[PDB]
From Swiss-Prot, chain A:
Gene that produces this protein: BTS1
Binding site for isopentenyl diphosphate: K38, R41, H70, R87
Record text on cofactor binding: Binds 2 Mg(2+) ions per subunit.
Main location as per UniProt: cytoplasm
Species of provenance: Saccharomyces cerevisiae (strain ATCC 204508 / S288c)
Site residues, Important for determining product chain length: Y109
Name of this protein: Geranylgeranyl pyrophosphate synthase BTS1
Reactions performed catalytically: isopentenyl diphosphate + dimethylallyl diphosphate = (2E)-geranyl diphosphate + diphosphate; isopentenyl diphosphate + (2E)-geranyl diphosphate = (2E,6E)-farnesyl diphosphate + diphosphate; isopentenyl diphosphate + (2E,6E)-farnesyl diphosphate = (2E,6E,10E)-geranylgeranyl diphosphate + diphosphate
Alphabetized PROSITE patterns for the sequence: POLYPRENYL_SYNTHASE_1, POLYPRENYL_SYNTHASE_2
UniProtKB/Swiss-Prot annotation, chain B:
Protein name per its UniProtKB record: Geranylgeranyl pyrophosphate synthase BTS1
Binding site for Mg(2+) 2: D77, D81
Anything else known: Present with 2840 molecules/cell in log phase SD medium.
Keyword annotations from UniProtKB, A to Z: Carotenoid biosynthesis, Cytoplasm, Isoprene biosynthesis, Magnesium, Metal-binding, Protein transport, Transferase, Transport
Pfam families membership: polyprenyl_synt
Outcome (variant: H141A): Reduced affinity for isopentenyl diphosphate (IPP)
Length: 321, 317
């Protein structure tokens, strides 16, 4: 009867979980926290709040949700890309193992979800906030799924520039839109002008493309290691080169771009060969730089504020988010 | 001018997503569906519905939620245990790759979350439903995290039976409870079945752990040994050897688990320690029978509200 008594108690209570247990499974997450970036994201949220006027406490919870989603996304991204370093340091999966890191990142997606409850007690607003959360986590995973598919099954699908931009709207725009949409739903301010969603989609596009561009340009210049080549990613410049070489009939160059991506190599000279093919042969680096400038000018020349509601500064430090 | 026009259209619309895109992202998921198991789960849900009485379209959605979470959690589990097989079939990550399979399984957790908002339009109840989903997903991940931590940090921590049980309550009980709590919250009818479903969860996992070794003893690849899992019979063996001072046997068990071996002969060596030195396989068989009897001898219906047939077939949930 003593075992029966014991089982009886176990099953009539909530599952036992200790603060010691909590710390053990938080290791992969605690490790990525040590990296900087938190204040730059906080800074963009703060600037956007000059329009939305959420009270300090509410804004802090939006910020916590964003940090959990963002950091958990990176933990997963690094396992998905086989990345050995992030912000200059060893990637969590290489320390704690892939199993713990997947589970912990996934665990934090649900802690983020739980925080949404803390934003309001109003039932109609709550429903809306969780919908926004749900929609953008679905968008996020769709774009990421496509990015991974193209890369890992290359050359099955060679994306065009239009496909790439749609993938980024889902993958990168997800977190930017999730944050803005939560703020717009919670805003006490009557009408603070048109929605900023178009503006935030544009920031996400500039962000990803610049990210892609700098990963190669920094290596060309010195700084980095063009780890995107090692990963075989269909980045903005790679997408332009692949489509450029096809439409120009440069058969050998097109096949060599593909061969190098498929090697998943860490040879610096081989990565530099490809980078210089994009520099001199397909003019993909210059095309990309100009594309970025054009995107940034869409905001810098937005005199009638159809996009815009400090923000210029953020744009120049977008790589630091 | 035209570049800008195109960017304007892009940022002013919802992100573009086609059914062809949906199909590429779904492949790792469609693959595990080829696996049977659905019929058995639906039955348990149908049987529990004789007590809950949810209309059938609502019950269909609950069933859809269970299938997404369960199948997705299995896709992730195989990656976490590095399993090559699932029901005699190649696991998805070995076909579609670890990256696509992780993203697709996580995507499906959110497709499941979205189905929840379709269970009702009543706002108070909707909130309760999402809270249930959230809580149990949190419990599920805590339990999985502890299970993995023990295995990957062995031999830093050797769990006790009580620790193993709390882990199971989180890990395995999570989905059983999530399903039942949703069904009880929606019942249009007038004692809770959670204790019973928790007990089903514990029987489920201990029997799963038991058959993994017992199927191999009688022929089963005993993959749990290769993975180095702190399974119920191994927890019993490690603590029995510790307790009895059997220092070398204690260390030989750890050594074999730490080898991550596929060698049949070495895996049998582990099973002979369990069968001849600690009698852990027998002890486990007895433990499961005692849990099952709590239900068999529940004449007052303290736990209960066919279920017995399901319990002896629980091994295919
Ligand atoms: C506070 C206001 C919002 C700030 C959001 C800042 C980041 C949003 C844009 C980047 O989001 C992602 C999503 C994701 C991501 C998205 C998912 F949906 C899943 C996932 F696992 C990762 C990954 N990454 C990693 C990058 P990288 O390794 O180059 O720094 P990349 O490999 O995607 O280019 C970035
Ligand atoms: C009333 C009907 C309710 C739903 C019935 C089914 C409930 C789930 C039963 C299985 O629970 C799990 C959770 C999980 C699981 C739980 C998590 F929290 C995360 C995860 F990734 C997997 C995994 N597994 C896989 C097993 P195995 O590989 O032996 O088939 P095991 O590895 O637990 O032994 C099973």
């Amino acid at each position: 009867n003593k075992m029966e008594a014991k089982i009886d108690e176990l099953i009539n209570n909530d599952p036992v979980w200790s603060s010691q247990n909590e710390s053990l499974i938080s290791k992969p997450y605690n490790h990525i926290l040590l990296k900087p970036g938190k204040n730059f994201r906080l800074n963009l949220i703060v600037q956007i709040n000059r329009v939305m006027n959420l009270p300090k406490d509410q804004l802090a919870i939006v910020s916590q949700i964003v940090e959990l989603l963002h950091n958990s996304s990176l933990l997963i991204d690094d396992i998905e890309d086989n990345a050995p370093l992030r912000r200059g340091q060893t990637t969590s999966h290489l320390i704690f193992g892939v199993p713990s890191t997947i589970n912990t990142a996934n665990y934090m997606y649900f802690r983020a979800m739980q925080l949404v409850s803390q934003l309001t007690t109003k039932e109609p607003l709550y429903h809306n906030l969780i919908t926004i959360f749900n929609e953008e986590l679905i968008n996020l995973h769709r774009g990421q799924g496509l990015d991974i598919y193209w890369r890992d099954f290359l050359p099955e699908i060679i994306p065009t520039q239009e496909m790439y931009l749609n993938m980024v709207m889902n993958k990168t725009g997800g977190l930017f839109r999730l944050t803005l949409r939560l703020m717009e739903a919670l805003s006490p301010s009557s009408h603070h002008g048109h929605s900023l969603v178009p503006f935030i989609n544009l920031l996400g596009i500039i962000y990803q493309i610049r990210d892609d561009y700098l990963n190669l340009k920094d290596f060309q210049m010195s700084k980095g290691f063009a780890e995107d080549i090692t990963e075989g990613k269909l980045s903005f410049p790679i997408v332009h080169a692949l489509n450029f070489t096809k439409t120009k009939g440069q058969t050998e160059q097109h096949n060599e771009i593909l061969r190098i991506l498929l090697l998943r190599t860490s040879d610096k000279d081989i990565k530099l060969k490809l980078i210089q093919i994009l520099e001199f042969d397909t003019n993909s680096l210059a095309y990309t730089k100009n594309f970025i400038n054009q995107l940034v000018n869409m905001i810098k020349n937005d005199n009638e504020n159809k996009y815009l509601p400090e923000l210029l500064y953020i744009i120049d430090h977008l790589s630091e988010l």
